[PDB]
Ligand binder design. Structure first.
Ligand SMILES: [Cl-]
Ligand SMILES: [Cl-]
Ligand SMILES: [Cl-]
Ligand SMILES: [Cl-]
Ligand SMILES: [Fe+2]
Ligand SMILES: [Fe+2]
Ligand SMILES: [Fe+2]
Ligand SMILES: [Fe+2]
Ligand SMILES: [Fe+2]
Ligand SMILES: [Fe+2]
Ligand SMILES: [Fe+2]
Ligand SMILES: [Fe+2]
Ligand SMILES: [Fe+2]
Ligand SMILES: [Fe+2]
Ligand SMILES: [Fe+2]
Ligand SMILES: [Fe+3]
Ligand SMILES: [Fe+3]
Ligand SMILES: [Fe+3]
Ligand SMILES: [Fe+3]
Ligand SMILES: [Fe+3]
Ligand SMILES: [Fe+3]
Ligand SMILES: [Fe+3]
Ligand SMILES: [Fe+3]
Ligand SMILES: [Fe+3]
Ligand SMILES: [Fe+3]
Ligand SMILES: [Fe+3]
Ligand SMILES: [Fe+3]
Ligand SMILES: [Mg+2]
Ligand SMILES: [Mg+2]
Ligand SMILES: [Mg+2]
Ligand SMILES: [Mg+2]
Lengths: 161, 160, 161, 160, 160, 161, 161, 161, 160, 160, 160, 161
């Protein structure tokens, strides 16, 4: 038992209220993006429908895994996520997705904007998150990388060169 | 030759009432999935792991359910609305509470909200079936799957 | 603004005693079919042994999945299944499978008859089940379809010209 | 004690009218698969690849469907006929044109062919359902899957 | 040159006593599977899900086991009897009770049923081993797997 | 320094009308074989039903993969396949499959004959195809090999002693 | 404090020459069975061809896995296997498989006899093997079990009523 | 060869003795945690046994992959791990796991404490590791994230709310 | 005994001309794969996703192709050279341009470069076949696969 | 009815001697796995990769082995102790050295330590078999697997 | 209308000379597999594991090959003979030596055995190709795969 | 819409020309390494050929995935990769791989050097990349970690202790 600690209770790392708040911000925008992505997935029509229909689902898959990652990271650090519809609608920074069928060209522009809004939130909280807990900042890097890839894969459709 | 002569054969299109009925089912499935994840993350206490896991299975089912309904709407020329504001403003499910909740409370809460979701589907069933029996089969799969989830979750709290 | 319900306790659909009894009838015949299917699977000998040996196992798989589906549907609807050996033996409508080895030709006829009997139970309770709960009748349709396919695949061995 | 004592119990036999109704579904599903492959090979132009791929998924679904219907016929002791001459002579689908066809034309052509196939299933539905509800459920699966394919394909040409 | 020259070489035949010993194992394995499913459906209460799941794993093991024993009988030209009437009439397992049962009760009941099944295998072991060591190895696999299941289930009720 | 070609447009290999017609002949017989294979698969009854039922589906799988290979090879070489039902019926060299149920023994003989006919078409066009395009003849070799294996696996049911 | 052994060289279990010879006897019969199994698999014709064709390949798979197990067990215990064609032919106890095509019925009887012979070798050496090394006898039990199952699945074709 | 280096030997990044020491600290606590996790996995009894039994194995899987990651990172950086039992026992910071059967409630508290001790070690060395080699700090972030998730999944069992 | 008596049986070795012919194929396959990735990354515009995806499939095929040829060279005692300087200095493919390129331009560019690669293989085919028919079969697989890729890519730009 | 009447049928429980014998096997398997990983990480020199890989396969086998034994102890009401202090203080294996070691030295070292582990199992075998033949079968699997590992590792150092 | 009207159309029959040519390939492929396993078991020394593993891949390939050839014979109504006595009596491969052999010796021995097997295939190639080009393609696959194995194995002994 | 942004176009993060240049440097060395790895894979001969042959392919797999990661990260950040053969040859920092067959000992030393050169490039640009975009630095950490592991796995072959 030469280097063994003799403490009965050893407590875990606990997130500050600011840290908890910062992850909550990322969480709602990821959930909103997932909901908007599905709306777009269902209602997109027109030229190159199928590619967009499929890509939007991949976006949703990524944003859903992201939300679970962030929420469970909060839980791990003794913070409490709120992913409820009312909270998401009232607190998301994403511009509202429009109703009804939308052209593929419209959907490309709309969804690129909403991905970029989500990335902006993560980028905005990054430094404060990193200063408190570098391990969580690494989860943010995964999200930034994955989402910016989605934006490129989606926006390239509308690029005229 | 029995070949038809038309160059533009149109498909079955749903009435506004039918589309509205599927929209009702859609928002409650989306709401259930969001509440399911909330519960999944925030449940604590005796038998946490089983409940944490079962709730993810519920969410998986409700998400594929929502996709099925929304895409059935699209197939029949209806237009789904699964946006957060719409879901919040039009869902019939009792609001799930914020914060950590005990496994026993989560069992009771989620069972109620699953039953609320099944109730929506059962309420619209006959009107859906009358117009399009094929869509009612999709509703049957939902009723079956969700009622199975209700049983698997609620049994935790049963007395004898 | 809000369409949210306000009850703290919302109850699930509860099957009538009659409905429960009807599903119980299906259950015992499916279990009996599974047990007879294995008996036949072990004890068949003669011309085209292997095919029947293999097909019988597929029948047993389907009947076992079937019994679990029915029993769990009962549980979902607050009914209580009884799949115990004594109950199955005492209440199954299937003719007893004979003892010892049986020829491929005999097993074909015997098992086809027992599938037909199992399906007849499902068809007999169908309308009463459908009237109370259309979602359960759909599970019955899957059973009817899957079992009648098994009957075709098995019986065709003995069909001539 | 509840055991039935007859040595041979007969199964459910389809009437010949039922058999003929499923035969109508079968030939159109087969025709659709053959037309689907024709389109899959010969489609050219803007968004070729998506169409090429989606057409194969349609064919996969129609082939599984024709197997399902033919085997259901056999299960009920009806006898299917999926031979080329019969399919050509009795299909209700408009003929697919020869040669390379643009993606836009293929979209419209195949949507029409799918809609014709669904129409056949919808036309026989009630007579099939009246004799055998379990078979009608298979028809529901086909209606659901084909109408989904129609939506996935036609959306390419939709202007909003 | 070392080749045997007889046209038919006979295989190893089990004595009827050996066959009867394996028959004893078979009925108890089948009874256990049927009781296992009964418990799996009807268990309710604290830690429902773990028990529900573990009971299915037990049933899987007992079903594979009964197949192994019945097929070993056939390999040695014995003839198994796994029919409902025979199983009910000849199983050594205490009857499983009807109705919903609490998780605590199910734990104790099933542990007893597993232990009865293992006892049968242990009881016939030496007579089986004396005639055919290869069959005794299958019995060892069953003893090992069932006693593992007994430990996994009973641990739920263990107070320390 | 550099071996780079400087043309901005380099054309692909274009099949002659004769070559296209030869592959078209293969195509229709493969599709016809697939259709007859399914007919036999559904409608075979009698001794050893299951084996033939199963083997026929493997034949259909191979013939379907075959037809796609040939049709796509045509497309690659700027030829245009015709796999429509009317064309297949009007131009196939296979004897018509008879209607209604057929015995296992009859199905064995019938299907073996139709595979033999399909292979004969491929063998008949082989040398002309090989002369123009050796790479396409290799695809023909795969078809010949795979189909003659199917013929062996099917026909051996009826071969005595 | 410490129960650690202090030898720098600890030797493994070394089989006696007799033990090695006993496993060699098993080995040659397993290889011979594999070779005869393939011969039968290629050359069987007649009623229920496909089932026997398929089952024979499963037998060959088991016998091949068996020969590798035995040969490697020999190697583990510092014995040296001989699986060369000349040795197998010169020392196998199996009756020779006859040449050319054989009927399904004949193949059933022939192969059953050869499995019985293979198992008899294993049963003959069993007690001597078990006495020296119980762990090796367990591998023998797996072989006996798996081969006698093959014999049942094959022979049952010819068993009447 | 315009930007090509012309050096025969190009050496890799080598860890300082301090860095090597820091990774060694993480290594022994990960190994100790794996050994304690297995002890808990085997000996846990009581209410919710199965969930805990299963979760503890997932913990062990993660801690074992972690130890291999750390040890091989050491090797990559020309450092030498010591994962031997004596070294692990003499140098681990984890409180000793108690002997005998332990209740699920006890195991939850015990294992949460030991996970937290392991995380503390990683958190303690993090800044020094990051200052020398950011790529290795990222491996530490994976470990922190994964272990703190395990702690949350385990400790939630004992939480009374 | 028909057993051969030699202790050192040597294998087939390729002529310098043969090795040089396979080297020609090798550099064009490597170049195609590098250009394929360049296009995959830098393509933009209408139907980006389909082209992005198809180009990766082309690259996959060309990379396995290059490995096949280089390893066939090794089997026959030839020595491949797939180094960047060698590929750049000896490839027959027109250089792929830098920077972003439209999907329409990428279709035309990549089709030309696939055709250039096929041309190399077709040019060396007869000399390869004359020496070693087994290697010509590998060439046939390449011609078939690449010409399929050309068709799948170029069809995007087709008019009617 | 042959049904047993007992409500509480107990399972087979091991003697203290038996539990102690399995404990002996357990600590040597755990020690072998720790030494296996040490060797896996620290081996260098000629044929490094093969040895690195084989040692992981050894570790995999020893870890599943330790779990099998410890869980067999639990099934029979024995209590394993796999803690680091216990393993270090009670293992019979010669200590594996620290630091980098050549492949040739690693081969010799690991072979010795595998043989030490097999020796433990062989030493306790008869006493285990006498009490519980089913557990001896688990020991046979261990002896077989580890002796296979010894052969695969040691053959590297063999002379002719 | 283009339908042939004969009731039985005969398939392609191999001449007996063709059959005998494939028989030559078959026995050498079988001999190679048996020698491959002999080597796989008995190889010892430096780089044991790589050789042990590579020899099994060779055996896998040769076994698939012998099946391919024997089944091609059957497809064309030739009748294979793969019996031990026939293989020993008619194989052209030099006998594999008894006992343990060093990795260096095994490398050289097996390379020779592979080269002998390839020589047989190359020797019959033109006669096989003249009668049936499709069979020659199978021979090409064998030549390609075996010569790859020869390169992978012999490279171990190559000094540069 | 309480926190919702009301902007039509929200732009993504764009890499500076320096950042783009820095990723381009990493890209060419990863591509060069993949090409050299394959050259080595094909042409390596001598003692322990197979292990090296196999390890070199794993290296190539990793370097190819790396190049795609870097290139697509550039695309995501509105930078434009150049992976063309001429560019790679003219701008790589890796010493040229020699022609012809090379001994396993030679290949080990050669490839270790070239991996180390590639790692050096990534390490050289790391701080500038991290300062501008921490999410991209994390991708570099993956590359450093993965490549240094390959170097250790390859170089250990030549280590004499
Ligand atoms: Cl679980
Ligand atoms: Cl089968
Ligand atoms: Cl796609
Ligand atoms: Cl390897
Ligand atoms: Fe960082
Ligand atoms: Fe209905
Ligand atoms: Fe229905
Ligand atoms: Fe349904
Ligand atoms: Fe060829
Ligand atoms: Fe080929
Ligand atoms: Fe044993
Ligand atoms: Fe065993
Ligand atoms: Fe990371
Ligand atoms: Fe050729
Ligand atoms: Fe024993
Ligand atoms: Fe989760
Ligand atoms: Fe969807
Ligand atoms: Fe269940
Ligand atoms: Fe079918
Ligand atoms: Fe079975
Ligand atoms: Fe296709
Ligand atoms: Fe082996
Ligand atoms: Fe490792
Ligand atoms: Fe390679
Ligand atoms: Fe375990
Ligand atoms: Fe075969
Ligand atoms: Fe990519
Ligand atoms: Mg597209
Ligand atoms: Mg639980
Ligand atoms: Mg059969
Ligand atoms: Mg090696």
């Amino acid at each position: 038992m030469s280097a063994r600690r003799t403490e009965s209770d050893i407590q875990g790392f606990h997130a500050t209220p600011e840290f908890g708040g910062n992850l909550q911000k990322v969480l709602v925008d990821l959930i909103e993006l997932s909901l908007q992505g599905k709306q777009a997935h269902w209602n997109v029509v027109g030229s190159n429908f199928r590619d967009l229909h499929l890509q939007l689902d991949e976006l949703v898959d990524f944003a859903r895994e992201g939300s679970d990652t962030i929420a469970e990271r909060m839980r791990a650090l003794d913070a409490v996520p709120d992913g409820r519809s009312d909270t998401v609608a009232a607190t998301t920074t994403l511009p509202e997705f429009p109703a009804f069928e939308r052209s593929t060209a419209d959907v490309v522009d709309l969804i690129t904007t909403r991905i970029n809004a989500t990335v902006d939130t993560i980028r905005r909280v990054h430094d404060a998150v990193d200063a408190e807990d570098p391990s969580t900042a690494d989860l943010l890097h995964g999200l930034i990388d994955g989402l910016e890839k989605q934006a490129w894969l989606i926006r390239s459709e509308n690029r005229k060169v």
